[PDB]
Design an enzyme around this catalytic site. Structure first.
Site, PDB file in Angstrom:
ATOM      1  N   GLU A  75       1.194   0.006  14.113  1.00 21.65           N
ATOM      2  CA  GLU A  75       1.588  -0.322  12.751  1.00 21.65           C
ATOM      3  C   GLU A  75       2.114   0.879  11.967  1.00 21.65           C
ATOM      4  O   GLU A  75       2.862   0.683  11.001  1.00 21.65           O
ATOM      5  CB  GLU A  75       0.438  -1.014  12.021  1.00 21.65           C
ATOM      6  CG  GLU A  75       0.402  -2.530  12.238  1.00 21.65           C
ATOM      7  CD  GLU A  75      -0.237  -2.962  13.538  1.00 21.65           C
ATOM      8  OE1 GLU A  75      -0.755  -2.105  14.270  1.00 21.65           O
ATOM      9  OE2 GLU A  75      -0.198  -4.172  13.844  1.00 21.65           O
ATOM     10  N   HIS A 127      -3.260 -15.842  16.365  1.00 19.72           N
ATOM     11  CA  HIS A 127      -1.877 -16.142  16.021  1.00 19.72           C
ATOM     12  C   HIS A 127      -1.564 -17.624  16.143  1.00 19.72           C
ATOM     13  O   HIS A 127      -0.525 -18.075  15.650  1.00 19.72           O
ATOM     14  CB  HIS A 127      -0.935 -15.341  16.911  1.00 19.72           C
ATOM     15  CG  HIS A 127      -1.177 -13.866  16.867  1.00 19.72           C
ATOM     16  ND1 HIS A 127      -2.178 -13.257  17.591  1.00 19.72           N
ATOM     17  CD2 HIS A 127      -0.548 -12.879  16.188  1.00 19.72           C
ATOM     18  CE1 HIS A 127      -2.160 -11.958  17.356  1.00 19.72           C
ATOM     19  NE2 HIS A 127      -1.181 -11.703  16.507  1.00 19.72           N
TER      20      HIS A 127
END
Ligand SMILES: *[C@@H]1O[C@H](CO)[C@@H](O[C@@H]2O[C@H](CO)[C@@H](O)[C@H](O)[C@H]2NC(C)=O)[C@H](O)[C@H]1NC(C)=O
Ligand SMILES: *[C@@H]1O[C@H](CO)[C@@H](O[C@@H]2O[C@H](CO)[C@@H](O)[C@H](O)[C@H]2NC(C)=O)[C@H](O)[C@H]1NC(C)=O
Ligand SMILES: *[C@@H]1O[C@H](CO)[C@@H](O)[C@H](O)[C@H]1NC(C)=O
Ligand SMILES: *[C@@H]1O[C@H](CO)[C@@H](O)[C@H](O)[C@H]1NC(C)=O
Ligand SMILES: *[C@@H]1O[C@H](CO)[C@@H](O)[C@H](O)[C@H]1NC(C)=O
Ligand SMILES: *[C@@H]1O[C@H](CO)[C@@H](O)[C@H](O)[C@H]1NC(C)=O
Ligand SMILES: *[C@@H]1O[C@H](CO)[C@@H](O)[C@H](O)[C@H]1NC(C)=O
Lengths: 597, 676
Positions: A357, A487
């Protein structure tokens, strides 16, 4: 003037108010997503409904703008983002039902606790209370209990809810000039004939399939290796030529193979990659991990962290009771601020998520000069791919030794490099067929060629055909076995990770070629590589504005994706595996099942 | 208390040549070895230095034991130096009275102390030395030697080594030095070393190194000498008598040298610009080597005496305090025009402020905007973002330049921007600032646009609504305290400066020195730098405006802002100069053209009447030549010529001709024979 200038000034207006109000939309999203409260509920309400309303009405009044009249291809691709993501064709009742479905998914998945019948009160949540249960916890009868209890505790409330959710999403995508929800998930990989040679989503299915065909032998060798190393630890529960039990993977629902690495390293008796106690004693916290990341990024030639990135964007618990649903999450807020959150520990995989990230943030500042509707990834894959390439290049033990992370007496022999490549082989290639079968199963479900009575008997059969995993109980159809992942509960697109790993080694082949570092992409750390880093920087900076096929043609001199970077990244591991599973047989058999045997 | 008894002499000066002697090094610390002009108080080369010989061959021997009046003005070259420790010590009172402050100078090694104190004394002090066993002959003598008390300035240190014993030969000494006291800097720069001649000021290379600086800085306009007559034994007649000495007095004038500063300030060929046409040619060449050919020199035949500046007596405090600490929070569409009116601002002091981001100027550098001061000025204070700070530069076009505040392509001004984090950032979003990202055309420079119209995008008659094809141009920034540096709230002040013929209004902080009457000076006035004689001549000048033009921007006329009186600048020397044949080779003599004006006006209008004797035997009182381009003095006419071929020699035939073949007394000359 003609309507192209009108479209240009409209997109100028839309971009500037989009930044103007989507900044506090994403800021309130970050504020809820970092602290849970009761008035952050209304913060979500405004940062949802308001932004959705203005975005939808600005796209709705864009419908009169002809796409084909536009000659400027970034403006063109802006119109294919904005107009094609038009008004939802569901009614107000249907759309609010859909949003309630999403909220129900997130709430009931985020509260799941598998609880023993004798003491149902004392039990743990999924994260971080149940992730250890599928890991180092031996004597797998309680692993079986936790697996079955978690499957029931998602199934009994989310099987028909998912089944009806599929129909709503298929109806939503049907009115969006797309055949199914998989097609609206695949619309991100769309180009034109002038530059990207069209590249329809039919090209996406055929490219995904041809990627998967020749990653199957490498995964098959890896699976045979893991089977042979679970033979001695786990007696008779694994067939010599069959599949492997689903409840006995690295984590819950068999997503990662991370914690199988202590159970699968061949000759890890020597000192190896693990530096966690040295992370404890060096004082390297999450913040120092981030300063290490920005030394890596000023070494590669990418911009460093901003002052907002210092003062805001708290990762872990700040000691003030700010409850966070912590997952590795970057934030392109728009304008100038960028944020990072996760429960940042000091372990290896979380260190690579920190770099992952962080590379997401580097990506976001690199196309920060782009329009806001272009201010996304070059596709669903590149956006994770860049951060994961950074995470993989920083993970190399040569890099760990150079900047003082790793011990001075570490050896760079062939065997420890094979052990590191094995850890990467788990953390990547044990997920490639899992993500391929899961996204392909999504595509089959959203296409609707399989009715609801046979979703599970399909789900567990390419679990034995594409990823070669068997399960103890197929749970019939009453449970929702594929719906207990993160997800899929929040309904994130899951081809993101598959194409992330596809483009990962292509970008790493570029960052081993232009950076010209030796070693067959294993010790090919990209630190202090200004030329390859800046080449990657234009590859980031073109962003979504130019189609990602042209971006791939720019970075690796190939307009299409390919498997061969997997070969040049894993060929000594592969050749090792043929000289490692020579006793066993490569592949799997669907006949042997723990319920059948 | 001292009487002019037997021994004294009259003035009887020896106006001899100053030679290539006496160049000190300003900026003692080593520089970037630039061979640039060095302007200031400096010693003329080969000037009429007053040598007086205080010799004792006979009883009288024309003894220069006198105490003559000697003016200081802007400095002294003093070479009253000899290794025999004679006439050491000097008194340098401004008027040589009790009111005047006497700055003594010690040139002996027995006590190196320089004190001012008061030093009230009569016409003649004295010193002597009889006998001592350490080759010092008791140089300190029982006398009065004035007195010291309540000293305003004092310098005490170890008595370091200067000189001792006696010279082996007549003037075996090269320990010359130069003094001038100004602004807390005092030059005692010397060249302590023995060099022997017969009896002359030697023509050795002027390379005297810096010695010390003193913070005294007391002004000196006149001075005096001091003598030492030996009581014990200068001669066996045991009379009061100065030993054999030959001492020098020269003065420093406002002029220019050429200094290499090659190795810690050393030089290879020191060249005083106002020496001869070869010297000014060298000064214009910016090097240490003469070229061979026709050559135009710089306008430094006589240098500016003073640097006169004449700013308006404003002494006002500008509103820049409420420009950078401004509560006026504007926007780029509503950009302010805060006129500073008539004031004196601390220019480039905000540039010293380290909290400020971008002080790019584009037309007037931050250094030259303190002294060049401005007729009109505006503030232009508003808010932009970081990419808009990049946009607000005059050569850059975009949504903040084309569709908002635009700058002209020259702008003759400067722009400052800085961060207004935690000043213009609201946690809920500071939307109070706006911009106009839509306009029908690009904005002309300095065009305000408050008009919040419908922008008429396409052919849609909006009339108060934002339709499908109608867009609101007046759109907000949207700042946050968490927002990034590229979108951070930046306060910009576009300090627009312009200079016209109008009188100056806001100027830089400095003292306007008092005007000179009639002298070639470095006039600054309202920042208008240049050279020339200030004259009170009145011409047809408009009363309000100040910047004259004359011809080809000669700008003769400029107004004194105090008494509103015109003050013309007539240049002390004019251009149109041409070195006909320079002196790189053995043609040592030289002559440069001056003007189309006749050379009879050179000492009176071109003002060469008070120059060095080199300008007399070379330029005022020597052979005169004339051409179509003007006149010059130093070369002579001749009836012999040839085809004019080589570019040396202007129009009438002259080149690097030789004359040693006819006679070897003077070698080559600059006689206009033939362009070879
Ligand atoms: C928890 O998250 C909220 C966001 O909803 C933060 O905002 C404050 O929440 C408290 C609730 O106790 C309110 O009283 C304040 O008015 C909120 N501040 C605002 C809206 O600016 C809150 O800061 C977070 N908790 C901590 C400890 O930081
Ligand atoms: C204006 O604000 C500044 C700080 O933002 C004050 O601080 C400095 O004051 C000195 C004089 O003592 C100035 O020379 C500096 O230029 C100022 N600025 C900085 C950045 O150092 C200043 O005193 C304020 N002035 C007024 C009139 O309020
Ligand atoms: C980023 O790098 C620049 C250039 O070295 C530096 O000035 C700035 O302080 C850095 N920002 C950080 C470390 O947050
Ligand atoms: C950021 O700055 C603010 C004020 O300057 C301060 O209160 C805050 O603690 C800082 N955050 C950091 C250093 O993480
Ligand atoms: C190269 O990168 C390493 C980090 O691995 C860093 O420590 C080093 O300073 C960089 N430069 C050189 C010249 O080694
Ligand atoms: C791989 O490592 C082994 C030691 O474990 C070594 O014997 C072998 O030679 C290595 N392979 C190559 C190609 O060097
Ligand atoms: C600050 O002002 C001084 C004058 O006293 C000047 O010499 C200096 O250059 C200024 N600072 C900068 C950074 O220019």
């Amino acid at each position: 003037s003609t309507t192209e200038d009108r479209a240009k000034i409209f997109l100028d207006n839309f971009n500037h108010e989009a930044e103007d109000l989507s900044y506090q939309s994403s800021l309130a999203s970050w504020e809820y997503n970092t602290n849970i409260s009761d008035e952050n509920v209304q913060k979500m309400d405004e940062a949802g409904a308001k932004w959705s309303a203005f975005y939808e009405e600005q796209s709705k009044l864009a419908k009169n703008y002809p796409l084909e009249e536009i000659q400027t291809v970034p403006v063109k691709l802006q119109l294919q983002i904005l107009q094609q993501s038009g008004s939802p064709v569901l009614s107000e009742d249907k759309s609010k039902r859909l949003n309630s479905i999403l909220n129900a998914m997130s709430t009931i998945y985020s509260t799941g606790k598998v609880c023993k019948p004798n003491n149902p009160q004392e039990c743990f949540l999924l994260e971080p209370g149940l992730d250890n249960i599928m890991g180092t916890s031996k004597d797998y009868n309680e692993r079986l209990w936790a697996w079955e209890g978690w499957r029931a505790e998602v199934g009994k409330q989310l099987r028909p809810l998912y089944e009806e959710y599929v129909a709503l999403k298929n109806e939503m995508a049907r009115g969006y000039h797309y055949e199914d929800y998989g097609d609206y998930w695949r619309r991100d990989y769309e180009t034109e004939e002038s530059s990207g040679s069209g590249y329809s989503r039919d090209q996406l299915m055929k490219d995904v399939d041809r990627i998967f065909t020749e990653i199957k032998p490498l995964y098959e060798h890896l699976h045979a290796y893991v089977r042979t190393k679970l033979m001695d630890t786990y007696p008779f529960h694994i067939s010599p030529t069959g599949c492997l039990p689903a409840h006995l993977l690295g984590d819950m629902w068999g997503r990662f193979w991370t914690n199988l690495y202590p159970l699968t390293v061949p000759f890890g008796q020597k000192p190896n990659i693990d530096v966690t106690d040295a992370m404890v004693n060096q004082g390297w916290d999450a913040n120092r991990i981030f300063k290490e990341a920005e030394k890596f990024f000023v070494s590669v030639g990418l911009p460093n962290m901003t002052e907002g990135f210092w003062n805001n964007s708290m990762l872990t618990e700040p000691g003030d009771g700010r409850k966070v649903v912590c997952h590795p999450t970057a934030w392109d807020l728009g304008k100038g601020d960028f944020r990072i959150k996760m429960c940042t520990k000091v372990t290896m995989e979380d260190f690579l998520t920190a770099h992952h990230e962080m590379g997401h943030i580097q990506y976001d500042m690199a196309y920060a000069t782009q329009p806001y509707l272009l201010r996304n990834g070059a596709n669903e894959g590149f956006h994770e791919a860049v951060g994961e390439v950074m995470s993989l290049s920083v993970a190399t033990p040569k890099h760990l030794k150079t900047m003082g992370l790793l011990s001075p007496d570490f050896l760079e022999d062939n065997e420890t490099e094979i052990n590191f490549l094995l850890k990467q082989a788990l953390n990547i290639v044990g997920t490639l067929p899992f993500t391929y079968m899961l996204e392909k199963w999504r595509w089959m479900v959203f296409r609707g060629e399989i009715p609801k009575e046979e979703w599970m008997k399909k789900w567990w059969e390419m679990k034995r055909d594409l990823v070669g995993v068997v399960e103890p109980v197929p749970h019939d159809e009453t449970y929702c076995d594929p719906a207990s992942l993160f997800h899929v509960a929040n309904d994130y697109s899951f081809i993101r990770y598959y194409t992330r790993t596809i483009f990962e080694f292509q970008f790493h082949e570029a960052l081993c070629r232009i950076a010209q570092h030796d070693g067959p992409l294993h010790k090919c750390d990209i630190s202090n590589s200004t030329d390859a880093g800046k080449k990657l920087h234009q590859m980031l900076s073109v962003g979504k504005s130019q189609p990602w096929t042209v971006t791939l043609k720019d970075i690796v001199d190939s307009r299409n994706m390919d498997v061969g970077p997997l070969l040049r990244y894993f060929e000594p591991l592969y050749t090792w595996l043929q000289e490692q599973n020579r006793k066993s047989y490569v592949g799997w058999n669907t006949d042997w099942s723990p319920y059948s045997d | 208390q001292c009487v002019n008894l037997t021994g004294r002499a009259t003035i009887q000066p020896s106006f001899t040549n100053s030679s290539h002697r006496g160049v000190y090094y300003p900026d003692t610390i080593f520089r970037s070895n630039s061979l640039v002009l060095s302007q200031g108080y400096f010693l003329p080369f080969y000037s009429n230095i007053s040598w007086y010989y205080a010799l004792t061959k006979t009883n009288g021997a024309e003894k220069r034991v006198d105490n003559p009046i000697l003016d200081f003005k802007d400095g002294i070259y003093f070479a009253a130096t000899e290794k025999s420790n004679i006439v050491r010590g000097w008194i340098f009172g401004t008027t040589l009275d009790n009111t005047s402050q006497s700055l003594l100078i010690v040139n002996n090694a027995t006590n190196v102390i320089i004190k001012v104190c008061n030093f009230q004394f009569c016409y003649d002090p004295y010193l002597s030395g009889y006998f001592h066993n350490n080759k010092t002959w008791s140089t300190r003598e029982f006398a009065v030697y004035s007195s010291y008390a309540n000293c305003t300035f004092e310098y005490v240190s170890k008595p370091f080594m200067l000189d001792i014993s006696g010279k082996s030969g007549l003037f075996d000494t090269l320990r010359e030095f130069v003094f001038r006291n100004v602004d807390g800097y005092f030059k005692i720069y010397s060249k302590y070393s023995p060099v022997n001649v017969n009896s002359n000021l030697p023509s050795g290379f002027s390379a005297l190194e810096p010695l010390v600086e003193l913070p005294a800085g007391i002004n000196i306009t006149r001075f005096r000498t001091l003598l030492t007559i030996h009581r014990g034994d200068p001669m066996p007649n045991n009379g009061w008598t100065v030993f054999s000495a030959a001492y020098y007095v020269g003065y420093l004038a406002p002029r220019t040298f050429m200094l290499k500063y090659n190795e810690n300030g050393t030089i290879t060929d020191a060249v005083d610009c106002s020496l001869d046409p070869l010297s000014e040619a060298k000064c214009t060449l910016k090097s240490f080597t003469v070229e061979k050919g026709i050559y135009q020199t710089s306008n430094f035949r006589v240098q500016p005496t003073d640097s006169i500046v004449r700013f308006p007596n404003i002494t006002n405090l500008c509103p820049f305090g409420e420009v950078f600490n401004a509560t006026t929070f504007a926007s780029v569409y509503a950009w302010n025009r805060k006129r500073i009116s008539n004031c004196v601002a601390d220019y480039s002091v905000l540039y010293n402020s380290t909290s400020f981001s971008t002080f790019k100027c584009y037309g007037v550098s931050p250094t030259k905007l303190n002294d060049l001061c401005f007729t009109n000025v505006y503030a232009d204070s508003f808010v932009v973002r970081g990419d808009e700070v990049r946009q607000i530069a005059p050569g850059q076009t975009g949504k903040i330049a084309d569709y908002n505040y635009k700058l002209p392509d020259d702008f003759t001004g400067c722009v400052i921007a800085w961060n207004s984090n935690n000043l213009d950032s609201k946690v809920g979003g500071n939307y109070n600032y706006l911009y106009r990202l839509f306009r029908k055309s690009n904005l002309k420079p300095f065009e305000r646009d408050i008009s919040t119209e419908i922008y008429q995008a396409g052919s849609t008659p909006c009339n108060g609504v934002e339709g499908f094809n109608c867009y609101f141009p007046l759109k907000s920034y949207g700042f946050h305290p968490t927002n990034g540096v590229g979108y951070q709230p930046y306060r910009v002040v576009v300090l627009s400066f312009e200079l016209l013929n109008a009188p100056a209004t806001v100027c830089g902080p400095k003292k306007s020195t008092n005007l000179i009457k009639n002298k070639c000076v470095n006039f600054n006035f309202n920042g208008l730098t240049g050279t020339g004689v200030l004259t009170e001549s009145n011409k047809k000048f408009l009363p309000f405006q100040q910047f004259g033009r004359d011809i080809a921007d000669t700008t003769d006329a400029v107004r004194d802002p105090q008494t509103l009186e015109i003050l013309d600048i007539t240049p002390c020397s004019f251009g149109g100069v041409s070195v006909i044949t320079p002196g790189t080779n053995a043609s040592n003599q030289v002559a440069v053209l001056y003007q189309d004006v006749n050379c009879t006006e050179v000492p009176v209008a071109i003002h060469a009447d008070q120059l060095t004797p080199t300008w007399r035997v070379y330029s005022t009182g020597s052979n005169v030549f004339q051409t179509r381009a003007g006149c010059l003095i130093g070369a002579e006419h001749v009836n012999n010529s040839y085809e004019c071929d080589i570019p040396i020699g202007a129009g009438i035939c002259a080149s690097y001709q030789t004359q040693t073949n006819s006679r070897s007394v003077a070698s080559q000359s600059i006689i206009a024979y033939t362009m070879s």
